[PDB]
Amino acid sequence: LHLILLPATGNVAENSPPGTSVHKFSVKLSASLSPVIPGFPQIVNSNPLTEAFRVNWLSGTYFEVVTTGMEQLDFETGPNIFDLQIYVKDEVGVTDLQVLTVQVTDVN
Protein backbone atom coordinates (compact mmCIF):
# COMPACT_ATOMS: atom_id res chain seq x y z
CA LEU A 1 0.00 0.00 0.00
CA HIS A 2 0.96 3.60 -0.63
CA LEU A 3 -0.62 6.90 0.36
CA ILE A 4 -0.65 9.05 -2.76
CA LEU A 5 0.26 12.72 -2.10
CA LEU A 6 0.91 12.36 1.59
CA PRO A 7 4.12 13.65 2.61
CA ALA A 8 2.43 17.01 2.18
CA THR A 9 1.32 20.28 3.73
CA GLY A 10 -2.28 21.36 4.16
CA ASN A 11 -3.69 24.79 4.94
CA VAL A 12 -6.80 25.65 6.94
CA ALA A 13 -8.14 29.13 7.48
CA GLU A 14 -8.24 30.42 11.05
CA ASN A 15 -11.97 30.52 11.85
CA SER A 16 -12.79 27.65 9.55
CA PRO A 17 -16.29 26.13 9.47
CA PRO A 18 -16.89 22.59 10.72
CA GLY A 19 -16.60 20.61 7.52
CA THR A 20 -13.98 22.55 5.61
CA SER A 21 -11.33 20.92 3.44
CA VAL A 22 -7.65 20.69 4.35
CA HIS A 23 -6.03 18.19 2.00
CA LYS A 24 -7.12 15.75 -0.70
CA PHE A 25 -5.11 12.54 -1.01
CA SER A 26 -5.47 9.05 -2.48
CA VAL A 27 -4.26 5.48 -2.02
CA LYS A 28 -2.76 3.13 -4.60
CA LEU A 29 -3.96 -0.40 -3.91
CA SER A 30 -0.68 -2.36 -3.88
CA ALA A 31 -1.20 -4.24 -7.22
CA SER A 32 -3.34 -6.94 -5.53
CA LEU A 33 -6.60 -4.90 -5.71
CA SER A 34 -7.37 -5.61 -2.05
CA PRO A 35 -9.50 -2.65 -0.91
CA VAL A 36 -9.18 -0.51 2.18
CA ILE A 37 -10.78 -1.61 5.46
CA PRO A 38 -13.81 0.73 5.79
CA GLY A 39 -12.76 2.21 9.10
CA PHE A 40 -9.48 3.27 7.48
CA PRO A 41 -7.51 5.55 6.72
CA GLN A 42 -7.59 7.03 10.20
CA ILE A 43 -5.50 9.51 12.15
CA VAL A 44 -3.58 7.65 14.84
CA ASN A 45 -1.47 10.48 16.24
CA SER A 46 -1.14 14.23 15.97
CA ASN A 47 1.93 16.20 16.89
CA PRO A 48 0.66 18.26 19.90
CA LEU A 49 -2.59 16.32 20.17
CA THR A 50 -5.65 17.19 18.10
CA GLU A 51 -9.21 16.42 17.21
CA ALA A 52 -11.21 18.08 14.39
CA PHE A 53 -9.20 16.80 11.44
CA ARG A 54 -11.38 13.80 10.59
CA VAL A 55 -10.47 11.95 7.39
CA ASN A 56 -13.47 11.72 5.06
CA TRP A 57 -14.06 9.48 2.06
CA LEU A 58 -14.72 11.16 -1.26
CA SER A 59 -16.22 9.35 -4.25
CA GLY A 60 -13.84 6.51 -5.11
CA THR A 61 -10.50 5.56 -3.61
CA TYR A 62 -9.86 9.26 -2.95
CA PHE A 63 -10.01 10.63 0.59
CA GLU A 64 -9.91 14.03 2.26
CA VAL A 65 -8.95 15.52 5.62
CA VAL A 66 -11.81 17.59 7.01
CA THR A 67 -12.08 19.66 10.19
CA THR A 68 -15.11 18.35 12.06
CA GLY A 69 -15.28 21.37 14.36
CA MET A 70 -14.86 19.51 17.63
CA GLU A 71 -11.85 21.78 18.26
CA GLN A 72 -11.59 25.37 17.07
CA LEU A 73 -8.56 26.69 15.19
CA ASP A 74 -7.63 29.92 16.94
CA PHE A 75 -4.35 31.27 15.40
CA GLU A 76 -4.03 34.21 17.82
CA THR A 77 -3.48 31.50 20.43
CA GLY A 78 -1.90 28.10 19.89
CA PRO A 79 -1.24 25.69 18.39
CA ASN A 80 -0.90 26.71 14.74
CA ILE A 81 0.85 23.72 13.14
CA PHE A 82 -0.18 20.08 13.47
CA ASP A 83 1.40 16.92 12.09
CA LEU A 84 -1.33 14.33 11.74
CA GLN A 85 -0.30 10.88 10.55
CA ILE A 86 -2.67 9.00 8.27
CA TYR A 87 -2.90 5.23 8.49
CA VAL A 88 -4.33 3.42 5.45
CA LYS A 89 -4.59 -0.38 5.86
CA ASP A 90 -6.17 -2.85 3.45
CA GLU A 91 -8.11 -6.12 3.63
CA VAL A 92 -5.15 -8.51 3.62
CA GLY A 93 -3.29 -5.92 5.68
CA VAL A 94 -0.21 -4.04 4.58
CA THR A 95 -0.26 -0.73 6.40
CA ASP A 96 1.13 2.64 5.37
CA LEU A 97 1.56 5.53 7.81
CA GLN A 98 2.08 8.97 6.28
CA VAL A 99 2.19 12.47 7.72
CA LEU A 100 0.02 15.46 6.83
CA THR A 101 1.52 18.68 8.19
CA VAL A 102 -1.43 21.01 8.75
CA GLN A 103 -0.84 24.74 9.14
CA VAL A 104 -3.30 27.38 10.35
CA THR A 105 -3.45 30.70 8.51
CA ASP A 106 -4.30 34.10 10.02
CA VAL A 107 -7.74 35.52 9.07
CA ASN A 108 -7.48 39.34 9.53
Binding site: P7, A8, T9, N47, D83, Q85, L97, V99
Partner: protein, 235 residues
Protein backbone atom coordinates in the same frame (compact mmCIF):
# COMPACT_ATOMS: atom_id res chain seq x y z
CA UNK B 1 49.66 36.64 -57.16
CA UNK B 2 50.27 34.00 -54.50
CA UNK B 3 48.31 30.82 -55.36
CA UNK B 4 45.54 30.25 -52.83
CA UNK B 5 42.61 27.88 -52.61
CA UNK B 6 39.24 28.20 -50.87
CA UNK B 7 38.27 24.69 -49.70
CA UNK B 8 34.88 23.71 -48.32
CA UNK B 9 34.07 25.49 -45.10
CA UNK B 10 35.54 28.87 -46.02
CA UNK B 11 32.54 31.09 -46.85
CA UNK B 12 30.44 29.55 -44.07
CA UNK B 13 29.13 31.21 -40.91
CA UNK B 14 29.38 28.67 -38.13
CA UNK B 15 28.16 30.08 -34.84
CA UNK B 16 30.55 28.15 -32.60
CA UNK B 17 33.68 28.94 -34.64
CA UNK B 18 36.52 31.15 -33.37
CA UNK B 19 37.46 33.97 -35.74
CA UNK B 20 38.81 37.50 -35.57
CA UNK B 21 36.55 40.37 -36.60
CA UNK B 22 37.16 44.01 -37.56
CA UNK B 23 36.79 46.34 -34.60
CA UNK B 24 34.06 48.84 -35.20
CA UNK B 25 34.73 52.08 -33.26
CA UNK B 26 38.55 52.05 -33.42
CA UNK B 27 40.47 54.00 -30.85
CA UNK B 28 37.76 53.16 -28.32
CA UNK B 29 39.22 52.98 -24.84
CA UNK B 30 37.05 50.78 -22.59
CA UNK B 31 36.35 51.71 -19.00
CA UNK B 32 38.84 50.36 -16.51
CA UNK B 33 38.54 46.96 -14.86
CA UNK B 34 38.19 47.14 -11.10
CA UNK B 35 38.28 44.32 -8.55
CA UNK B 36 34.69 43.13 -8.19
CA UNK B 37 34.41 40.32 -5.61
CA UNK B 38 33.36 36.86 -6.65
CA UNK B 39 34.71 36.37 -10.18
CA UNK B 40 33.62 33.07 -11.71
CA UNK B 41 35.71 31.54 -14.50
CA UNK B 42 34.08 28.12 -14.90
CA UNK B 43 30.40 27.22 -14.59
CA UNK B 44 31.36 23.96 -12.89
CA UNK B 45 32.20 26.09 -9.86
CA UNK B 46 28.51 26.98 -9.87
CA UNK B 47 27.75 23.28 -10.28
CA UNK B 48 29.88 22.36 -7.25
CA UNK B 49 27.75 24.37 -4.80
CA UNK B 50 25.24 22.50 -2.63
CA UNK B 51 21.74 23.26 -3.87
CA UNK B 52 18.47 21.91 -2.52
CA UNK B 53 16.83 19.02 -4.35
CA UNK B 54 13.04 19.45 -4.57
CA UNK B 55 12.53 15.97 -3.10
CA UNK B 56 8.79 16.38 -2.53
CA UNK B 57 7.78 17.37 -6.07
CA UNK B 58 4.28 15.95 -5.94
CA UNK B 59 1.29 17.64 -7.55
CA UNK B 60 0.31 19.68 -4.50
CA UNK B 61 3.69 20.78 -3.17
CA UNK B 62 5.22 22.18 -6.37
CA UNK B 63 4.88 25.92 -6.35
CA UNK B 64 5.42 25.86 -2.58
CA UNK B 65 8.42 25.86 -0.26
CA UNK B 66 7.25 22.54 1.19
CA UNK B 67 8.46 20.63 -1.88
CA UNK B 68 12.02 20.73 -0.55
CA UNK B 69 11.47 18.46 2.44
CA UNK B 70 9.77 15.20 3.32
CA UNK B 71 8.32 14.37 6.72
CA UNK B 72 9.55 11.35 8.68
CA UNK B 73 8.04 9.67 11.72
CA UNK B 74 8.45 6.81 14.18
CA UNK B 75 7.55 3.60 12.37
CA UNK B 76 7.86 -0.03 13.35
CA UNK B 77 8.94 -1.57 10.04
CA UNK B 78 11.53 -0.19 7.64
CA UNK B 79 10.01 1.85 4.81
CA UNK B 80 11.64 3.33 1.72
CA UNK B 81 11.39 7.02 2.51
CA UNK B 82 12.66 8.67 -0.66
CA UNK B 83 14.03 7.72 -4.09
CA UNK B 84 16.16 10.03 -6.20
CA UNK B 85 16.83 8.48 -9.63
CA UNK B 86 20.33 9.51 -10.67
CA UNK B 87 19.29 11.42 -13.78
CA UNK B 88 20.32 14.94 -14.69
CA UNK B 89 17.16 15.21 -16.79
CA UNK B 90 14.91 14.26 -13.87
CA UNK B 91 13.21 17.29 -12.34
CA UNK B 92 14.75 16.45 -8.96
CA UNK B 93 18.27 17.15 -10.15
CA UNK B 94 17.68 19.33 -13.22
CA UNK B 95 16.27 22.24 -11.19
CA UNK B 96 19.30 22.43 -8.88
CA UNK B 97 22.55 24.29 -9.58
CA UNK B 98 24.37 21.07 -10.52
CA UNK B 99 21.54 19.88 -12.72
CA UNK B 100 20.85 23.17 -14.44
CA UNK B 101 24.54 23.43 -15.27
CA UNK B 102 24.73 19.80 -16.42
CA UNK B 103 21.56 20.14 -18.52
CA UNK B 104 23.49 22.42 -20.87
CA UNK B 105 25.86 19.56 -21.71
CA UNK B 106 24.97 16.36 -23.52
CA UNK B 107 27.37 14.20 -21.48
CA UNK B 108 28.65 14.19 -17.92
CA UNK B 109 31.17 12.10 -16.02
CA UNK B 110 31.92 12.28 -12.32
CA UNK B 111 30.69 11.78 -8.80
CA UNK B 112 27.68 13.38 -7.11
CA UNK B 113 27.59 14.59 -3.54
CA UNK B 114 24.11 14.34 -1.98
CA UNK B 115 23.79 15.82 1.51
CA UNK B 116 20.72 15.07 3.63
CA UNK B 117 19.77 17.35 6.52
CA UNK B 118 17.08 16.54 9.08
CA UNK B 119 15.39 19.59 10.59
CA UNK B 120 13.86 18.51 13.90
CA UNK B 121 14.31 19.38 17.55
CA UNK B 122 17.44 18.68 19.56
CA UNK B 123 15.99 15.51 21.11
CA UNK B 124 14.86 13.70 17.96
CA UNK B 125 17.44 11.13 16.90
CA UNK B 126 17.47 8.54 14.16
CA UNK B 127 19.60 6.39 11.88
CA UNK B 128 19.03 6.36 8.14
CA UNK B 129 20.53 4.18 5.42
CA UNK B 130 21.22 6.15 2.23
CA UNK B 131 21.95 3.65 -0.53
CA UNK B 132 23.11 4.19 -4.10
CA UNK B 133 22.11 1.36 -6.40
CA UNK B 134 24.69 1.20 -9.23
CA UNK B 135 23.56 1.17 -12.88
CA UNK B 136 21.93 -1.99 -14.17
CA UNK B 137 20.37 -2.80 -10.81
CA UNK B 138 16.67 -2.67 -10.05
CA UNK B 139 15.22 -0.25 -7.52
CA UNK B 140 15.61 -2.26 -4.28
CA UNK B 141 12.18 -2.21 -2.47
CA UNK B 142 13.85 -3.98 0.49
CA UNK B 143 16.55 -2.73 2.82
CA UNK B 144 18.41 -6.03 2.39
CA UNK B 145 18.42 -5.37 -1.36
CA UNK B 146 19.50 -1.76 -0.83
CA UNK B 147 22.36 -2.41 1.60
CA UNK B 148 24.14 -4.45 -1.08
CA UNK B 149 24.94 -1.25 -2.98
CA UNK B 150 26.94 1.87 -2.21
CA UNK B 151 25.45 2.96 1.09
CA UNK B 152 26.09 5.07 4.17
CA UNK B 153 24.42 4.92 7.58
CA UNK B 154 24.09 8.21 9.41
CA UNK B 155 23.13 8.93 13.00
CA UNK B 156 21.32 12.09 14.11
CA UNK B 157 22.86 14.24 16.84
CA UNK B 158 24.98 17.43 17.27
CA UNK B 159 25.04 17.90 13.47
CA UNK B 160 22.08 17.50 11.17
CA UNK B 161 23.80 16.80 7.86
CA UNK B 162 25.44 13.83 6.21
CA UNK B 163 26.85 13.43 2.71
CA UNK B 164 26.67 10.36 0.50
CA UNK B 165 29.20 10.49 -2.32
CA UNK B 166 27.47 8.84 -5.27
CA UNK B 167 30.61 7.49 -6.96
CA UNK B 168 31.27 7.33 -10.68
CA UNK B 169 30.33 3.76 -11.55
CA UNK B 170 29.73 3.40 -15.28
CA UNK B 171 30.63 1.25 -18.24
CA UNK B 172 31.33 4.13 -20.60
CA UNK B 173 33.49 7.13 -19.96
CA UNK B 174 30.61 9.61 -20.10
CA UNK B 175 26.98 9.35 -19.06
CA UNK B 176 24.18 10.97 -21.04
CA UNK B 177 22.36 13.88 -19.46
CA UNK B 178 18.95 12.96 -20.86
CA UNK B 179 18.62 9.61 -19.14
CA UNK B 180 18.08 6.49 -21.21
CA UNK B 181 18.27 2.80 -20.35
CA UNK B 182 21.74 2.34 -21.85
CA UNK B 183 23.50 4.91 -19.65
CA UNK B 184 21.15 5.19 -16.69
CA UNK B 185 22.86 6.36 -13.53
CA UNK B 186 21.09 4.19 -11.00
CA UNK B 187 19.07 5.23 -7.99
CA UNK B 188 19.63 6.85 -4.61
CA UNK B 189 17.25 5.61 -1.93
CA UNK B 190 16.78 6.76 1.67
CA UNK B 191 15.76 4.13 4.22
CA UNK B 192 15.16 3.93 7.93
CA UNK B 193 18.14 2.16 9.41
CA UNK B 194 16.79 1.83 12.93
CA UNK B 195 13.94 4.38 13.11
CA UNK B 196 13.35 8.08 13.65
CA UNK B 197 12.58 8.47 17.35
CA UNK B 198 11.23 11.91 18.38
CA UNK B 199 10.65 13.07 21.99
CA UNK B 200 6.88 12.60 21.58
CA UNK B 201 4.74 9.85 20.12
CA UNK B 202 3.51 11.76 17.08
CA UNK B 203 6.61 13.87 16.60
CA UNK B 204 8.08 14.47 13.17
CA UNK B 205 11.27 15.44 11.42
CA UNK B 206 11.81 17.20 8.12
CA UNK B 207 14.52 15.74 5.89
CA UNK B 208 15.93 18.01 3.19
CA UNK B 209 18.56 17.19 0.59
CA UNK B 210 21.19 19.12 -1.35
CA UNK B 211 23.27 17.99 -4.31
CA UNK B 212 26.54 19.16 -5.81
CA UNK B 213 29.42 17.99 -7.98
CA UNK B 214 32.60 16.32 -6.86
CA UNK B 215 35.93 17.80 -8.04
CA UNK B 216 36.41 14.99 -10.58
CA UNK B 217 33.16 15.83 -12.39
CA UNK B 218 33.41 16.79 -16.07
CA UNK B 219 30.98 17.80 -18.82
CA UNK B 220 31.17 17.99 -22.60
CA UNK B 221 29.10 18.69 -25.74
CA UNK B 222 27.44 21.97 -24.79
CA UNK B 223 23.87 22.01 -26.06
CA UNK B 224 20.61 23.86 -25.52
CA UNK B 225 18.96 23.58 -22.20
CA UNK B 226 15.59 21.82 -21.87
CA UNK B 227 15.10 23.95 -18.72
CA UNK B 228 14.18 27.01 -20.79
CA UNK B 229 11.29 27.69 -23.16
CA UNK B 230 10.05 30.66 -25.16
CA UNK B 231 6.50 30.52 -26.50
CA UNK B 232 5.66 34.24 -26.63
CA UNK B 233 7.69 37.19 -27.87
CA UNK B 234 9.34 39.34 -25.21
CA UNK B 235 8.27 42.92 -25.87
Amino acid sequence: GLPTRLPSGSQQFMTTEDEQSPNILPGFHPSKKIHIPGMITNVMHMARVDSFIPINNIQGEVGKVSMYYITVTKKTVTERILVLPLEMSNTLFATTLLGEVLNYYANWSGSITITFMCVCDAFSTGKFLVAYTPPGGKLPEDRKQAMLGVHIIWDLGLQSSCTIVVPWISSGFYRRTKADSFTHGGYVSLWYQTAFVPPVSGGTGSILATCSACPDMSVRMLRDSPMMEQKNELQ
